Amino acid sequence: SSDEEANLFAHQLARAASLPMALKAAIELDVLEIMAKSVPPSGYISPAEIAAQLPTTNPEAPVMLDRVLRLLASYSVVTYTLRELPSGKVERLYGLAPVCKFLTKNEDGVSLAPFLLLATDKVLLEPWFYLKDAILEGGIPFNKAYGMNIWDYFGTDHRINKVFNKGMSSNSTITMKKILEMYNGFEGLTTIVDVGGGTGAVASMIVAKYPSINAINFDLPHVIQDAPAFSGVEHLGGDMFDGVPKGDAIFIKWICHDWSDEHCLKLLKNCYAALPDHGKVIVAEYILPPSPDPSIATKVVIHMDALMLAYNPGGKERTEKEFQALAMASGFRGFKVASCAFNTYVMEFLKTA
Amino acid sequence: SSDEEANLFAHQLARAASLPMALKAAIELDVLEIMAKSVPPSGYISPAEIAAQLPTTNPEAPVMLDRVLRLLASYSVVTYTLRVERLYGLAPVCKFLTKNEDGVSLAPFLLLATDKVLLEPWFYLKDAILEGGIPFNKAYGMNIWDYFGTDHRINKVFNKGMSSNSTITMKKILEMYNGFEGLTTIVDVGGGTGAVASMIVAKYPSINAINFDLPHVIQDAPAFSGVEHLGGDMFDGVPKGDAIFIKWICHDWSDEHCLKLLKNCYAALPDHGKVIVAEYILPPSPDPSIATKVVIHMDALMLAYNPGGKERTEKEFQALAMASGFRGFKVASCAFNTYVMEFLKTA
Numbered sequence A: 001s002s003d004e005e006a007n008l009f010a011h012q013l014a015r016a017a018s019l020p021m022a023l024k025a026a027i028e029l030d031v032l033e034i035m036a037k038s039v040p041p042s043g044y045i046s047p048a049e050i051a052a053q054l055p056t057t058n059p060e061a062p063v064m065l066d067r068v069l070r071l072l073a074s075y076s077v078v079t080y081t082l083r084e085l086p087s088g089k090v091e092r093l094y095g096l097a098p099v100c101k102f103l104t105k106n107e108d109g110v111s112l113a114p115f116l117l118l119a120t121d122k123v124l125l126e127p128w129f130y131l132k133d134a135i136l137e138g139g140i141p142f143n144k145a146y147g148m149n150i151w152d153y154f155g156t157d158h159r160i161n162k163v164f165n166k167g168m169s170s171n172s173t174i175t176m177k178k179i180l181e182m183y184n185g186f187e188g189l190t191t192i193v194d195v196g197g198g199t200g201a202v203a204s205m206i207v208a209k210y211p212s213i214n215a216i217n218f219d220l221p222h223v224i225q226d227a228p229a230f231s232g233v234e235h236l237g238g239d240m241f242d243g244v245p246k247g248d249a250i251f252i253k254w255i256c257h258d259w260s261d262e263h264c265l266k267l268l269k270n271c272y273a274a275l276p277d278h279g280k281v282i283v284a285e286y287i288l289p290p291s292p293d294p295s296i297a298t299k300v301v302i303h304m305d306a307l308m309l310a311y312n313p314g315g316k317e318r319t320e321k322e323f324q325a326l327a328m329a330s331g332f333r334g335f336k337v338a339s340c341a342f343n344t345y346v347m348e349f350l351k352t353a
Numbered sequence B: 001s002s003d004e005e006a007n008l009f010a011h012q013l014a015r016a017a018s019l020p021m022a023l024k025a026a027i028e029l030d031v032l033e034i035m036a037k038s039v040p041p042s043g044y045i046s047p048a049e050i051a052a053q054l055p056t057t058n059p060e061a062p063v064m065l066d067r068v069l070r071l072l073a074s075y076s077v078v079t080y081t082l083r084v085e086r087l088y089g090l091a092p093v094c095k096f097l098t099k100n101e102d103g104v105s106l107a108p109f110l111l112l113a114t115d116k117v118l119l120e121p122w123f124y125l126k127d128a129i130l131e132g133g134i135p136f137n138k139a140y141g142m143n144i145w146d147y148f149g150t151d152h153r154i155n156k157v158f159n160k161g162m163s164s165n166s167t168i169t170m171k172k173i174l175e176m177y178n179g180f181e182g183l184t185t186i187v188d189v190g191g192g193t194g195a196v197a198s199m200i201v202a203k204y205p206s207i208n209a210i211n212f213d214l215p216h217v218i219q220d221a222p223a224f225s226g227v228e229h230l231g232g233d234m235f236d237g238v239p240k241g242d243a244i245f246i247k248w249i250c251h252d253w254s255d256e257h258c259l260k261l262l263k264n265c266y267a268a269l270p271d272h273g274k275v276i277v278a279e280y281i282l283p284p285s286p287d288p289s290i291a292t293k294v295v296i297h298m299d300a301l302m303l304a305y306n307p308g309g310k311e312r313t314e315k316e317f318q319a320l321a322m323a324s325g326f327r328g329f330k331v332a333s334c335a336f337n338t339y340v341m342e343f344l345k346t347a
């Protein structure tokens, strides 16, 4: 019965995708939001009460919903309680687990739900069918699937460009709120460039905290076209590999992990050129731990490394030494790990140390 | 703290689909088999040494494979050591993902589970909840079995997947369950390419078996001494025998459809015959045990694929037996999370 446990595990592995796809459906139905707003003083609500708030009105909706919520409950995505009905049978009622705090809109209208919709999108699951091909043939699984780099594909496909940019905006909003409570390194700058800033969430947050700072959000044209106006942020489109806007500091969050070491050095030399004599690059990334331990924090970084292998041209997760090596090879003389929040480190690459 | 943990958990949820796709790639590359046959007594081998057995001259193949194995190692799918370069070995689950003594593993089953065709329905779950219908049918414009009868590739993947999983479960069941003793003719209804029938005949050479499924399945069934492969539709009726065996058939169908099948079974059997049902049995709550998760995962899969298919409790199975004319019911045996029930014609 080491056998029994191993056979079970193999089954669990085989079906693991069903959990995020069940969660995706629950998000796309607005179930977790319906729960947050309807739950009584107990904490729990029935699938029938949930389903009366959905636009259906499929008589099989309440049972289908219960079956989905039961899977989420088994993994503690939602909580549950049992209630015995006269009509003997016991039903499940569902409540919010702590993770739902990040899967439903906070006080400012933000959650990780759009990030989950990106992670579970048909476009991001397709490259995984070409992992074996890329290993044997060379190249990038995404490019085998779509015939071009991820960014170029986003420039062709308006729906996924929007899902991607919204997903990064949401995740970054949540993490940068915490980084900004811990990290002081934006204090005193007069101008900050967010290179690869997406739709400008991070730039906007920096301006909100430091009203005197002028921020530049720089990304590809096809991203910058959808960036909402925010007073104190200028959205500039271009290509970071040709050059970046000038500023007192440059912020790059989740950019280096997208790119090979050679591409990173190219970018970082462009950042060095764009900065004044004593300026800096602020790098926000995961940092690879020494081993594939089974901690969730490590598992999450290793999962990202594998995503970078599926998606990106040479992208990968890096150790602190590897980052320090990049800084050095692009001309910076100092390196600091400055801060950490929600598993994301903030590094500074200083032109003078 | 609690926020840090909850943030982490949302991220772990978001990327959980890729774990099985990484494993799929490893199985398609034959990595687990190469490891099994190539590890030295230490039990560990480098990604470069594995990649040297792959049909490639991509110089990046080693590092790519390293990255994939690192993910599998983080989930305890493979083991690892440091020499800093990582070497990797097989964890206990790999015994079920690499051929055993009999040439069988669950690797074809994982390849089924991760096939592009079966992941597509999950994009239409929300549509089925809101509009009705079946996520599979929304994706492909026909029901699952009909799709298989149009697509040779996926037919083969599905039948090999079921065959591999059934051979592993059924071997354990047959050490445990004696209810096939004394029959002359067993009919395996929805028995796929016939693995289970062939195992029954091999343990009881005195039994003769009918392996009955759809024609597009029976077309691919290999021959086995004392099994006859018969194409048809179980909803039109089923072949006669002393007993009928149905494994992972009930869960494919709504209660109304199960009743139709079960009445057919009743009619093909003599006054003293029984239906032998092998299924999961739903436990009384969404507890976190892996055994319960597995049954709940399957319940959710039936939601994606099938018309009213679902996992059931013992009480529900007994109600199906009663409503289709069977007067006796018992839970006979269990192995590898699969119960064997008998639906007996008499009290």
Ligand SMILES: Nc1ncnc2c1ncn2[C@@H]1O[C@H](CSCC[C@H](N)C(=O)O)[C@@H](O)[C@H]1O
Pocket: A151, A168, A169, A172, A195, A196, A197, A198, A199, A218, A219, A220, A223, A238, A239, A240, A241, A252, A253, A254, A255, A258
């Ligand atoms: N050559 C190029 N120049 C500028 N931006 C680019 C680029 N190639 C990719 N990008 C941008 O790099 C970003 C990586 S995703 C990270 C977005 C953002 N920093 C955040 O953390 O939320 C995308 O917005 C993408 O469009």
Ligand SMILES: Nc1ncnc2c1ncn2[C@@H]1O[C@H](CSCC[C@H](N)C(=O)O)[C@@H](O)[C@H]1O
Pocket: B145, B162, B163, B166, B189, B190, B191, B192, B193, B212, B213, B214, B217, B232, B233, B234, B235, B246, B247, B248, B249, B252
């Ligand atoms: N109407 C029908 N009549 C006969 N077989 C059918 C059917 N509809 C579905 N099936 C068969 O039901 C099987 C369901 S999967 C289970 C297969 C096998 N009993 C095992 O456990 O390995 C498939 O082989 C499918 O082809």
Ligand SMILES: COc1cc(/C=C/CO)ccc1O
Pocket: A118, A119, A120, A121, A124, A150, A254, A255, A257, A258, A307, A311, A312
């Ligand atoms: C390709 O770039 C990124 C992708 C993801 C994952 C998106 C999932 O569909 C997360 C961070 C990135 O910089």
